[PDB]
Antibody, heavy 217, light 216 residues
Framework: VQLVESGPGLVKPSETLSLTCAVS????????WSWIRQPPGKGLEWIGG????????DYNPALKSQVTISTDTSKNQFSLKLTSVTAADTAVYYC??????????????????WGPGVLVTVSSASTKGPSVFPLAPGTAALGCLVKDYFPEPVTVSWNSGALTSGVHTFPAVLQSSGLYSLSSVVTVPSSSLGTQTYICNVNHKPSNTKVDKRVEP | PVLTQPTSLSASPGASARLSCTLS?????????IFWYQQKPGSPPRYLLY?????????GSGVPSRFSGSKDASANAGLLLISGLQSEDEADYHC?????????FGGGTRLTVLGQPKAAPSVTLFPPSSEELQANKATLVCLISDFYPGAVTVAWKADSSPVKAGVETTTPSKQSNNKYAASSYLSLTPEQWKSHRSYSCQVTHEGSTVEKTVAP
């Protein structure tokens, strides 16, 4: 049995998050199913469950007003609908087939078969190129701050790719504004600061923008 | 929370891991079945087992006997015991219980199986650039590197007072030297930045805390 979550990776706040779980090598009608999500860097949260046989549902009480979980036996799918989303709904979403076993005549349910999960990001932001600011400096650390761009990704190089040693580019953060930010840093000899030119090259393909920032002491 | 798990834990290969899942006092652990899941990077969680008592428990299919469940009544906690630790056992371990029409999850414990020497983090803190300030913005950038295991906590301070608002922090990831690095940001207004004596980025890693401070 294989589960594959599908749906838009981006949803605007107050709008509706919709996701479909395609199931192969198994029948929807003969099992119970659940949606579970995991915000970046956080723990798991059970959204809700549905009985493939009765169609009855059980939603997380803290999410009651948002959740709709339905089934489509025709195409062997089951879907999730989250209305009026906010930044709290940014997460990796998993569709799951529940396991069931009887122990001492007691029913035990667990999360048995999992899909790979899909990231859904909530942001009101539209496509926007980055603003690049210099992070001015034995050895010396200098960098550039790649601020307020959307969407991911960007790539960073130094001196058009001629500088790779000691270069470290960090993962992006999602700010409360709905825009991304990251930083790249390189460690260079202090004596090179007055002789060598250091430029960070930032490439943001989604907006077709490249920004080069000369970083000076 | 209902279920409290340590954020991280580390142990040596071949040793034993004891992962705790502490239930808040309204939830007597003796009354609940504790479910455990194992999650490896970029991959969905995997059902390990559930445990209620010695006579009421079940192992997940394909899950070796070295993974076992137990309870600590005096601590009101569910336990996941792992013997003969292998490097592959490195994962995020989640506990869960069922209560009143809903599943409740713990925060998950990141277990590291030690595979290299421990190392305290190096910290570099950048003040807002002149260019950013002139664009009516201010960002403090705290770069953290060269640490192992890959679990740290980041706290920001305005003068000596803690600051939570405007903080974003990345999950630690390995660099080319096989050690971990992460980054944290503090967003400020130019006036906030200029009106304070100093701001600090404070990083905790196991028994050490490293703090860097910048001033306008």
């Amino acid at each position: 049995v294989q589960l594959v979550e599908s749906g838009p990776g981006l949803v605007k706040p107050s709008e509706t998050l919709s996701l479909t779980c395609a199931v192969s090598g198994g029948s929807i009608s003969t099992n119970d199913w659940s949606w579970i999500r995991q915000p970046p860097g956080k723990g798991l949260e059970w959204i809700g469950g549905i009985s493939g046989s009765s169609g009855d549902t059980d939603y997380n009480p803290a999410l009651k007003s948002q959740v709709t979980i339905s089934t489509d036996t025709s195409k062997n799918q089951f879907s999730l609908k989250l209305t009026s989303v906010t930044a709290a709904d940014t997460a990796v979403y998993y569709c799951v087939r529940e396991g069931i076993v009887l122990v001492n005549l007691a029913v035990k349910n667990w999360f048995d078969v999992w899909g790979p999960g899909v990231l859904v990001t909530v942001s009101s932001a539209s496509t926007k190129g980055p603003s690049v600011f210099p992070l001015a400096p034995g050895t010396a650390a200098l960098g550039c701050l790649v601020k307020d761009y959307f969407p991911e990704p960007v790539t960073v190089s130094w001196n058009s790719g001629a500088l790779t040693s000691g270069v470290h580019t960090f993962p992006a953060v999602l700010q409360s504004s709905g825009l991304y930010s990251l930083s790249s840093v390189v460690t260079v000899p202090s004596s090179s600061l007055g002789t060598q030119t250091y430029i960070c090259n930032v490439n943001h393909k989604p907006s077709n923008t490249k920004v080069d920032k000369r970083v000076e002491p | 929370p209902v279920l409290t798990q340590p954020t991280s834990l580390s142990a040596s290969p071949g040793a034993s891991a004891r992962l705790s899942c502490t239930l808040s006092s309204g939830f007597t652990v003796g009354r609940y079945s504790i479910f455990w899941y194992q999650q490896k990077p970029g991959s969905p969680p995997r059902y390990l087992l559930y445990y209620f008592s010695d006579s009421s428990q079940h192992q997940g299919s394909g899950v070796p006997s070295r993974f076992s469940g137990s309870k600590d009544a005096s601590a009101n906690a569910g336990l996941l015991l792992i013997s003969g630790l292998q490097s592959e056992d490195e994962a995020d371990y989640h506990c869960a219980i069922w209560h009143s029409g809903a599943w409740v999850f713990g925060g998950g414990t990141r277990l590291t199986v030690l595979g290299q020497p421990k190392a305290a983090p190096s910290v570099t803190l950048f003040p807002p650039s002149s260019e950013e300030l002139q664009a009516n913005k201010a960002t403090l950038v705290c770069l953290i590197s060269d640490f192992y295991p890959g679990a740290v906590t980041v706290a920001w301070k305005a003068d000596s007072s803690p600051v939570k608002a405007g903080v974003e922090t990345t999950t630690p990831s390995k660099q080319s030297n096989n050690k971990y690095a992460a980054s944290s940001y503090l967003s400020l207004t130019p006036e906030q930045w200029k009106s304070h004596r100093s701001y600090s980025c404070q990083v905790t890693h196991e028994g050490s805390t490293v703090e860097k401070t910048v001033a306008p």
